[PDB]
Every structure is written in C-alpha cells, then in structure tokens.
Design a protein around this motif. Structure first.
Motif, mmCIF file in Angstrom:
data_model
loop_
_atom_site.group_PDB
_atom_site.id
_atom_site.type_symbol
_atom_site.label_atom_id
_atom_site.label_comp_id
_atom_site.label_asym_id
_atom_site.label_seq_id
_atom_site.Cartn_x
_atom_site.Cartn_y
_atom_site.Cartn_z
ATOM 1 N N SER A 296 0.839 -1.207 0.000
ATOM 2 C CA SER A 296 0.000 0.000 0.000
ATOM 3 C C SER A 296 0.877 1.262 0.000
ATOM 4 N N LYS A 297 1.567 1.563 1.127
ATOM 5 C CA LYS A 297 2.438 2.734 1.241
ATOM 6 C C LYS A 297 3.588 2.713 0.224
ATOM 7 N N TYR A 298 4.198 1.538 0.008
ATOM 8 C CA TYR A 298 5.319 1.444 -0.921
ATOM 9 C C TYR A 298 4.989 0.674 -2.187
ATOM 10 N N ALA A 299 3.721 0.799 -2.647
ATOM 11 C CA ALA A 299 3.184 0.142 -3.843
ATOM 12 C C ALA A 299 4.051 0.340 -5.068
ATOM 13 N N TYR A 300 4.661 1.529 -5.220
ATOM 14 C CA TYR A 300 5.516 1.823 -6.364
ATOM 15 C C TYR A 300 6.593 0.762 -6.544
ATOM 16 N N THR A 301 7.378 0.511 -5.487
ATOM 17 C CA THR A 301 8.487 -0.432 -5.529
ATOM 18 C C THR A 301 8.027 -1.883 -5.424
ATOM 19 N N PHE A 302 7.027 -2.143 -4.573
ATOM 20 C CA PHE A 302 6.610 -3.489 -4.195
ATOM 21 C C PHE A 302 5.317 -4.118 -4.727
ATOM 22 N N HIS A 303 4.308 -3.318 -5.120
ATOM 23 C CA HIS A 303 3.035 -3.877 -5.586
ATOM 24 C C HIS A 303 2.917 -3.967 -7.110
ATOM 25 N N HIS A 304 3.050 -5.202 -7.635
ATOM 26 C CA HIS A 304 3.046 -5.497 -9.068
ATOM 27 C C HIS A 304 1.910 -6.440 -9.458
ATOM 28 N N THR A 305 1.059 -5.980 -10.377
ATOM 29 C CA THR A 305 -0.125 -6.713 -10.822
ATOM 30 C C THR A 305 -0.058 -7.088 -12.295
ATOM 31 N N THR A 306 -0.474 -6.174 -13.172
ATOM 32 C CA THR A 306 -0.540 -6.408 -14.615
ATOM 33 C C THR A 306 0.687 -5.903 -15.351
ATOM 34 N N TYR A 490 23.389 -8.995 -15.125
ATOM 35 C CA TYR A 490 22.213 -8.506 -15.824
ATOM 36 C C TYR A 490 21.466 -9.748 -16.327
ATOM 37 N N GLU A 491 20.128 -9.678 -16.424
ATOM 38 C CA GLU A 491 19.319 -10.792 -16.923
ATOM 39 C C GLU A 491 19.460 -10.884 -18.450
ATOM 40 N N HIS A 492 19.714 -12.100 -18.962
ATOM 41 C CA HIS A 492 19.849 -12.367 -20.398
ATOM 42 C C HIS A 492 18.425 -12.490 -20.951
ATOM 43 N N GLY A 493 17.871 -11.353 -21.354
ATOM 44 C CA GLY A 493 16.489 -11.274 -21.793
ATOM 45 C C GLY A 493 15.656 -10.770 -20.635
ATOM 46 N N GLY A 494 15.783 -9.472 -20.364
ATOM 47 C CA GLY A 494 15.129 -8.772 -19.266
ATOM 48 C C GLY A 494 13.642 -8.997 -19.131
ATOM 49 N N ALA A 495 13.225 -9.459 -17.952
ATOM 50 C CA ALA A 495 11.830 -9.710 -17.616
ATOM 51 C C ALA A 495 11.578 -9.336 -16.158
ATOM 52 N N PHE A 496 10.329 -9.027 -15.819
ATOM 53 C CA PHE A 496 9.981 -8.710 -14.445
ATOM 54 C C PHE A 496 8.684 -9.380 -14.085
ATOM 55 N N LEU A 497 8.766 -10.305 -13.119
ATOM 56 C CA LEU A 497 7.643 -11.078 -12.610
ATOM 57 C C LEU A 497 6.848 -11.747 -13.744
ATOM 58 N N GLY A 498 7.566 -12.466 -14.613
ATOM 59 C CA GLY A 498 7.006 -13.205 -15.744
ATOM 60 C C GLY A 498 6.817 -12.459 -17.052
ATOM 61 N N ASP A 499 6.742 -11.118 -16.998
ATOM 62 C CA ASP A 499 6.536 -10.297 -18.188
ATOM 63 C C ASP A 499 7.839 -9.802 -18.786
ATOM 64 N N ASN A 626 0.191 -21.686 -7.033
ATOM 65 C CA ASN A 626 1.592 -21.413 -6.772
ATOM 66 C C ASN A 626 1.910 -19.975 -7.194
ATOM 67 N N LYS A 627 1.128 -19.407 -8.147
ATOM 68 C CA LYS A 627 1.246 -18.020 -8.607
ATOM 69 C C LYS A 627 0.894 -17.019 -7.487
ATOM 70 N N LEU A 628 0.150 -17.472 -6.465
ATOM 71 C CA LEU A 628 -0.255 -16.691 -5.297
ATOM 72 C C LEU A 628 0.861 -16.691 -4.222
ATOM 73 N N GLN A 629 1.925 -17.483 -4.448
ATOM 74 C CA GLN A 629 3.072 -17.608 -3.556
ATOM 75 C C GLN A 629 4.352 -16.946 -4.100
ATOM 76 N N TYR A 630 4.345 -16.479 -5.361
ATOM 77 C CA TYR A 630 5.531 -15.862 -5.955
ATOM 78 C C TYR A 630 5.235 -14.689 -6.879
ATOM 79 N N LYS A 631 4.033 -14.649 -7.473
ATOM 80 C CA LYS A 631 3.657 -13.648 -8.463
ATOM 81 C C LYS A 631 2.679 -12.611 -7.924
ATOM 82 N N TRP A 632 1.567 -13.060 -7.340
ATOM 83 C CA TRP A 632 0.527 -12.167 -6.842
ATOM 84 C C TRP A 632 0.301 -12.296 -5.340
ATOM 85 N N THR A 633 -0.613 -11.472 -4.809
ATOM 86 C CA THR A 633 -0.994 -11.447 -3.400
ATOM 87 C C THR A 633 -2.526 -11.486 -3.281
#
Ligand SMILES: [Mn+2]
Length: 664
Positions: A296-306, A490-499, A626-633
């Motif tokens: 909530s307070k630090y959603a910018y850095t920490f809250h990732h959805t779509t 650096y990641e070989h083919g940059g991605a963030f939380l599956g995207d 398992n997506k509720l344990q690593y990807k979403w909340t």
C-alpha cells in the motif's frame, strides 16, 4: 571450521520430529519416489504421442523463432529469449542425485567475496531503515492458511480444522514458547508447543531447464546442475564434493519399460522446505500485516499486478536495468537475520516474538530422499538451533526477507556506482528513514521495482543517469561484481515477474512494452510441475485445482506476445500430427468441465454461473495457486476466489496476538 551435527532417523533427536500418527511416520521414512505425472486427466507426461508432439513442436518453434536478445540482454522483435527445448523433460522423473542442503553458507559467501556484515555505516543505516519502515504501523488481519497445505513437523496434518486449532493455540502460546527459547530451553518450547524441531526437506521439480542442440553432432545437451554430497553439506563445502547431477533419462527404459526418445532428460530438482507450522503461525500473523503495508504505502516499488501496471512505471525511466541474482536463497546472509532482530528489539517489538523469528532462521533441516538409498538424516541439533542455510523456503516471511535484502542491495548499488551526491542525505536513522521512504515511493531520480530476487532498476534524467549507463556497461562486461552483498549480473532477456520487457529499435524504456512470456505459456501447458491429482476429491486442496481455466485467461496473459498466434497454430498442427485431434477442442472441453466444477466450490456461483465475473488473475490462480506464492498477493484476487484456496483464523484472535507483539 565446525561440521554440523548429523543424526540418522533412528536417533531420538530425529524421532522427536515425527508425531505418533501414520502421516508423520510415513513422511519420516518416505523413500525416493519417481513416476510419470498425469499432465492432464488421462494423459501421462511420458505418453509416446505426447513426447512425439514435444519433439516436433520444440524443434519447429526454435527453428522459426530464434531468440531476439541484444548484447545488453534486452528482448526485441519476436519477444523470444531462448530456444524452446526446455519442454523436453520426462516430467515426474528427477535428476539423480538432488543436492544435500548446505548447513552453513559462511564459507560459500566468503569464497564468493561477499561481505559478512554491512560494509559501511550508511549500509547499516539503510538495512535498519528498511526494518523500521516495513515493521512500524501495522494493522491486524486474519491469519490466512492455504487449503491442503501441510503442518509439517511434527503432525504432518493437511486438515483445515486441525491447522486452524494448531494456529490458534500457537498464537496463544507463542509468548510462553519465545520466553523458553530466551532461556535456551528450545527442547521445552518444542515439546510443549511444537515451536522448533526442523524444516522438512521436499524436493520440487523445476519442470523446464536449459537444453541446447549441438549443431556439430545434432545431439541435445542438458544444462549441468551442480549438487553437494552429504560431506560437502555438513562441512559448508570444506570437505566432500560438488558435482553435476545426472539428467540422463536412458535408465527409464531399463527400470520402468518407458521409451525415451532422443534428447529427452530427467528434470531439475530444487530443495524446498516445509516449516514447523506452530512456529510459522506467529510469524505469519506479523508477515501478512507487513505485506499489506509495503504493498500500500510502498506500492511503487513493491506492488506489481498487470503488464500495464509495470509498464506505467518503467516508461517514465531514461534507463531500465534488469538484474539477476545468483542462487539468492542459499547466499542469503545470517548477519541480516541478526541485524533485523536487533532492529526489531530497538523498535520495541516483544523480545519473545523476535526470538521465535530469529530461531526460524537458524533451524535444523530434516533431509528426506535426495536419491535412492540416501537421506533420512537430520542436519543440526534442535536443542540449540545454529544453522546458516541461508533463507529457508518454508519460513513464514521468506518473501519479505528476500525483498528487504535485495531492495537495499540494489539501492546501495545505485548509490555506489551512480549517485554519490545522495550519500549526504543518509547521516543517521531519521534521515536514512526519510530518504528510504522517499526512494520506495518512487520520488527519487534513482528508482526500482522489485520482488525478492527479481528487479528492474531505474534512472530518470539527472546527475545519476550517466553513472547508471556505466553500471549497465560494468554488468555487460561481467568482470567485476557491482555489489559487496550478493552476486549480481544482468538478466539475459530482461523480464519482471514473468513479463518480458519488449524494446523497439530505439532500445529505450519510454517506447518499450511489457508482454507475456510465450515460453512460460508452453511451460505451464505442457510441462506443469505437478500432476492433476485426480484422486484428491477436494479440488481446492490440489496443486492444480482447475487446470482447464487457464485456457480462458490465455489471450489476456499471452495475447500481447508478437508470436502468440504462430505458437497456437504450431501447437494445433503438431497436436493433430501426434494425437489426430484438435488441441483447441480438447482445451475447450476441459475449460467447460472445469467451469462447471468451479461452481461447486464458490458459494456465490450458481450450478452453471460461468466465468463472467472472474478476472484473468483469478483464472491463472485457480489453475495454478503457486502463482499466489511468488507472483501475486491476496488483494489481487477476487474475494470469493481467495476463499476457495485459503481459510483464516479470526481477526479477533490475531488482533489480540498482534497487540502483544508490537510496540506500545
Ligand atoms: Mn528479471
């Protein structure tokens, strides 16, 4: 330099980890197990038609869609980052042997030239400021428990009623248990309240792993995965050996009568641990309120959805650096556990609670079955928890532990290499807190979006930008580690939380877009980690409750991939060749069946309600929780869907518990 004590299952110390019930006794003794997974109802992962399909499809897709990743690891064009050979595994058959978990990572860290504590006072203030911001003004919430999850040591119960009783009793007795531990009475805390003992080691499949086709020979080569033998694990690498596990699947013909086509391998196996539930419950009661604050307070850095939610932040950046961390959990430092604990004590947290938390990160480990005729050994003494395993996967706050370490590690990297002009803003605790609060809200010229070991580091226009480019260059060169804390590249083919971050000709974040990873669609549809568990009557307890539902969310999840249509057509053509059936019709039938089955589980859903009210996140989660344990909340899922997968302990019991833990 101190070998960890080891006890066979026959020893009283190991016997005490398993209660006098069939489930606990079977868990203690479970021998090495392997077998084909039921990929879908009535389809085995080793079915000759299925393997023929995987051979044709992986070869075709690699040929027609080669990877489009530049010299800086940026994905462009087709949105593909590697070959499609990762699907070529005999799912359910592991590599032999699996690793013995390291009892101490101190030598591992020292040999990798990583620090044994904060390097400077600035870094010490920043790690401590992270604790102060994350753990301060928390709000009590119900303690949510995953349905069908195990209580592990000592009961091994999967029953929700039993789990609720254990959790409520744990919140009532955590104070008395923590106080016993403060007196060094770990055996009493464990015997009376089941708080302590050990983590139970389960080996989880990583269903897809790197495979290459050697052009010289026309033979496939699987990626070698290094494993530690017992001697290496107990000595922290001082003695014993680190060697490549065998992924060779030829053995399956001799042992099981299974035909193994050319270039098909045994799966990579990773250590995963289940924590003693009575110890985890009081930790989870604090961990969930912390997540609610940071999201909530630090959603910018920490809250990732779509993909669009991530895109809006990244598009504002002048430079985006997609980082990679080598073996995060095993390298995670025990000095950070100690620093966190010391800071919580300074904030006014109940000492008994801090002791439970500290103990959860020093606990012994019970090794089940890494290979045939191996395992059934307890590493470490439960009478005095003193292990340095890194971060245990089943600890009640693992996501927060990795997020705290990594968020500060990345910020330090940005300060050291790009922004020395910001160092004057971090003079003491109040100024460190003000700076970090601003940085985490995305208010500084240096920014980040992160979750545990996945991140993207950003620079806007300003003084730090030039440094940002030098850091990216240093990462590309890969000769000097930019951090004293963890091994960063650096990641070989940059991605963030599956995207995948898809760049255009300009190679700038402003014109880059986040797209679904088409390879992940193939991993999820043809190489699931678990079978359908058709024998488990309660679907909400299965690892894959409603697999058919993923067909309905596919277009939303993967539709933005440049080669989406091409892949679906290649699947259809190859599935026709292998089965003489339409894959699309097969998935439409499964979707219909699972939609009907779902209404039995959702109170608000009538006998044939349909998927109309459900979001793509809801559907992906119902097919794979398992997506509720690593990807979403929790907040990302519709309330009526969250209730299908989780159950909670009343907020009345947690509210009373939280009041006793927290400062004044
Ligand atoms: Mn990444």
């Amino acid at each position: 330099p101190r070998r960890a004590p080891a006890f066979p299952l026959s020893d009283i110390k190991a016997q005490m980890l398993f209660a006098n019930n069939i489930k606990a006794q079977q868990a203690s003794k479970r021998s090495f197990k392997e077998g084909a997974i039921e990929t879908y109802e009535g389809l085995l992962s080793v079915d000759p038609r299925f393997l023929s399909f995987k051979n044709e499809l992986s070869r075709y897709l690699t040929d027609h869609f080669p990877a489009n990743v530049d010299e800086y690891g940026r994905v462009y064009g087709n949105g593909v980052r590697t070959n499609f050979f990762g699907m070529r595994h005999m799912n359910g058959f592991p590599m032999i042997p699996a690793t013995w978990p390291l009892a101490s990572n101190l030598k591992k860290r020292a040999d990798a030239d990583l620090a044994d504590g904060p390097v400077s006072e600035r870094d010490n203030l920043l790690f401590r400021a992270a604790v102060r911001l994350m753990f301060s003004d928390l709000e009590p919430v119900p303690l949510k428990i995953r349905k069908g999850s195990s209580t592990c040591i000592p009961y091994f119960s999967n029953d929700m009623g039993t789990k609720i009783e254990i959790a409520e009793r744990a919140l009532e007795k955590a104070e008395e248990a923590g106080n016993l531990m403060l007196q060094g009475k770990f055996d009493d805390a464990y015997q009376l309240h089941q708080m302590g003992g050990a983590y139970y080691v389960v080996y989880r499949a990583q269903s897809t792993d790197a495979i290459t086709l050697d052009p010289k020979t026309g033979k496939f080569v699987s990626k070698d995965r290094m494993v530690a033998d017992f001697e290496y694990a107990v000595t922290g690498g001082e003695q014993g050996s680190l060697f490549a596990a065998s992924k060779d699947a030829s053995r399956l013909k001799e042992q099981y009568g299974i035909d193994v086509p050319d270039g098909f391998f045994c799966e990579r196996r990773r250590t995963a641990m289940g924590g003693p539930f009575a110890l985890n419950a009081p930790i989870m009661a604090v961990a969930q309120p912390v997540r609610n604050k940071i999201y909530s307070k630090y959603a910018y850095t920490f809250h990732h959805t779509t993909r669009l939610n991530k895109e809006e932040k990244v598009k504002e950046w002048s430079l985006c650096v997609a980082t990679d961390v080598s073996d995060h959990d095993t390298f995670w430092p025990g000095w950070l556990r100690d620093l966190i604990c010391d800071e919580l004590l300074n904030m006014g947290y109940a000492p008994w609670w801090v002791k439970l938390f500290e103990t959860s990160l020093k606990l012994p480990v019970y090794v089940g079955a890494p290979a045939p005729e191996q395992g059934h050994t307890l590493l470490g003494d439960p009478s005095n928890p003193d292990l340095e395993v890194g971060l245990s996967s089943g600890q009640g706050a693992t996501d927060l532990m990795g997020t705290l370490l990594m968020s500060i590690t990345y910020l330090v990297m940005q300060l050291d290499h790009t922004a020395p002009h910001l160092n004057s803003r971090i003079k003491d605790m109040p100024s460190a807190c003000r700076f970090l609060d601003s940085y985490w809200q995305g208010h500084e010229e240096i920014r980040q979006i992160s979750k545990s070991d996945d991140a993207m580091l950003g620079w806007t226009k300003g003084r730090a930008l030039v440094g940002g480019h030098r850091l990216f260059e240093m990462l590309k060169e890969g000769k000097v580690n930019p951090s004293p804390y963890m091994k960063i590249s650096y990641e070989h083919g940059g991605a963030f939380l599956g995207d995948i971050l898809l760049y255009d000709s300009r190679r700038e974040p402003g014109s880059a877009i986040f797209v679904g990873n088409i390879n992940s669609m193939l991993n999820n549809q043809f190489s699931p980690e678990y079978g359908v568990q058709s024998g488990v009557r309660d679907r909400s307890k299965r690892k894959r409750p409603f697999p058919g539902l993923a067909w309905a969310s596919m277009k939303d999840t993967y539709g933005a991939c440049p080669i989406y249509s091409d892949v679906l057509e290649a699947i259809e053509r190859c599935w026709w060749n292998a089965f003489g059936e339409s894959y699309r019709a097969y998935r439409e039938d499964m979707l219909k069946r699972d939609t009907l089955e779902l209404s039995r589980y959702v109170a608000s859903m009538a006998r044939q309600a349909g998927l109309a009210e459900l979001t793509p996140i809801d559907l992906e989660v119902l097919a794979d929780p398992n997506k509720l344990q690593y990807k979403w909340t929790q907040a990302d899922v519709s309330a009526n869907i969250h209730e299908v997968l989780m159950h909670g302990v009343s907020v009345e019991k947690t509210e009373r518990f939280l009041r006793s833990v927290m400062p004044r």
